[PDB]
Amino acid sequence: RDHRKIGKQLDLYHMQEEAPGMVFWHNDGWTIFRELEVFVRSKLKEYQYQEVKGPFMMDRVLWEKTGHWDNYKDAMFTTSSENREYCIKPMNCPGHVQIFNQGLKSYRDLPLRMAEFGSCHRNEPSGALHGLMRVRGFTQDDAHIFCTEEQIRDEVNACIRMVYDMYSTFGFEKIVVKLSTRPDKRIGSDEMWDRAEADLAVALEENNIPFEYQLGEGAFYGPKIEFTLYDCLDRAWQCGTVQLDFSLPSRLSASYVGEDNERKVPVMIHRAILGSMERFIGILTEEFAGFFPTWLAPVQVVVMNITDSQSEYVNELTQKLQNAGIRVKADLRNEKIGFKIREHTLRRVPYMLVCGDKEVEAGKVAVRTRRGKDLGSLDVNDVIEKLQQEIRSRSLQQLEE
């Protein structure tokens, strides 16, 4: 269950000292990453999110206006050009306000929900680095909701729904929740904080989610909910955040026209569910011990022959699976069937499709899993329909037989 060990064995990624804390994603690892993105994108569509992309760097002068400069200055990478200093972004929030700022916005356009797989950089010390968990270059599944004060409650409700929806896809059911309240150094009135803390509380209570208050641990710009998941070893992983913000929009001149035809500043909600996606792949690697569910598996099916005699049956079967949209390889090497099954079991291939004479003659295929389960001979088109359904639904379970 060591993601560094498993990552090296399965050839997912590597790290080296010429680029501390930044991942070289190999083909198979990048396949896992991309499928994770596809999954998040399907959630973004279902929950009515835009997807944008911002630039990697921005003038220090703009970062000075955010309210984050003094707190982040030591953690940012900077770079110079033509007497101007640029910060490499450690967060996507200011960039999203820049996009919001183009074109006149109305009350009609709110809530405006804006997501991004934004590659951010944080200059942490080198000794603090550790595989995929603590990295310098990271991609959060971050997003921002711009809304009215009256809309906050419904939008936190949706965020909450989206969090438990996404976590239960990977088999994470034990979730611990903390609501962090007003710090000592903060902005805004006491009744603004009363309302904001009440909206987060009521939203959790409306969904029958237990939580503990964390006194004085909120950010200066608003209160937050944090979600901590537990893996199959019962280890805690803080991942999710819903963070209200009454500072950044006004700080970066964000506005919209209300029903009463008056200029109003929108409330901002920061939300990430998985958190750092590099880290989350690390968490999944250890949760599953390298046995990634079929939909995430780099190679989903390996088709193999017993002898040279079945090679063209394997080729046709392999082409059928390519056409069905399945990540498939053909193992036509001059090796024993047991040697082929052992190698791909160790590579954690979900399904091995074995083709002997009896399978060829009947128009069938013998299905073996990486767990060692023999599901017997099955009709080829029936196996493909069942493989598709497993992938389509993102099931944790392999087929029954």
- Whether 84 is catalytic: no
Residues 54-73 that bind a second copy (CB under 8 A): 54-59, 61-62
Residue type, 139: T
Residue 397 interacts with which of Zn ion, a second copy, none, CB < 5 to 8 Å by class: none
Task: Indicate the residue among 224 and 270 with the shorter CB distance to Zn ion.
Answer: 270
The span from the CA of 347 to the CA of 327, in Å, is: 14
- Would you list which residues are annotated within the binding site? 93, 142, 144, 270
Q: C-alpha 356: how far from its chain's center? A: 41
Residue 392 interacts with which of Zn ion, a second copy, none, CB < 5 to 8 Å by class: none
Return the range that interacts with a second copy (CB under 8 A); candidates 118-126, 291-299, 312-320, 387-395.
Answer: 118-126
* Among positions 53, 235, 336, 373, the unique one binding a second copy when judged by CB under 8 A: 53
> Pick the catalytic residue: 3, 28, 89, 93?
93
CA angle 72–137–348, rounded 5-degree value: 145
Task: Indicate the residue among 33 and 146 with the shorter CB distance to a second copy.
Answer: 33
Residue type, 267: V
CA angle 174–175–180, rounded 5-degree value: 160
Contact letters (x/-) for Zn ion, 254-273, by CB under 5 A?
Answer: ----------------x---
Who contacts 214 (Cβ-Cβ below 8 Å, separation ≥6)? 178, 179, 180, 181
The span from the CA of 328 to the CA of 30, in Å, is: 16
- Whether 224 is catalytic: yes
The span from the CA of 314 to the CA of 299, in Å, is: 16
Tell me how crowded residue 20 is: count the other CB atoms within 10 A of its CB: 16
CB 139 within 8 A of CB 120: yes
Tell whether residue 115 is a contact of Zn ion (CB under 5 A).
Answer: no
- Would you list which residues are annotated within the binding site for Zn(2+)? 93, 142, 144, 270
Cis upstream peptide for 210 (omega within 30°): no
Return the range that interacts with a second copy (CB under 8 A); candidates 25-33, 142-150, 219-227, 370-378.
Answer: 25-33
The span from the CA of 353 to the CA of 380, in Å, is: 10
Task: Indicate the residue among 118 and 240 with the shorter CB distance to a second copy.
Answer: 118
* Among positions 26, 105, 251, 329, the unique one binding a second copy when judged by CB under 8 A: 26
CA angle 344–347–348, rounded 5-degree value: 90
- Whether 344 is catalytic: no
Shortest CB 240 distance to Zn ion, Å: 13
Tell whether residue 254 is a contact of a second copy (CB under 8 A).
Answer: no
- Whether 3 is catalytic: no
The span from the CA of 132 to the CA of 277, in Å, is: 9
Instruction: Decide: residue 140, CB within 10 A, 0-12 exposed, 13-18 middle, 19+ buried.
Output: buried
> Pick the catalytic residue: 122, 182, 340, 368?
122
Residues 66-105 that bind a second copy (CB under 8 A): 77-82, 86, 88, 95, 98-99, 102-103
Return the range that interacts with a second copy (CB under 8 A); candidates 119-127, 229-237, 265-273, 310-318.
Answer: 119-127
- Lookup: tokens for 86: 């640029």
Tell whether residue 93 is a contact of Zn ion (CB under 5 A).
Answer: yes
> Pick the catalytic residue: 142, 199, 231, 245?
142
Place of tokens 């128009």: 363
Q: Is 82 helix (H, G, I), strand (E, B) or coil?
A: coil
Residues marked as catalytic: 93, 122, 140, 142, 144, 224, 270
Which residues form the interface with a second copy (CB under 8 A)? 11, 14, 16-19, 22-27, 30-31, 33-34, 50-59, 61-62, 77-82, 86, 88, 95, 98-99, 102-103, 114, 119, 121, 123, 125-126, 137
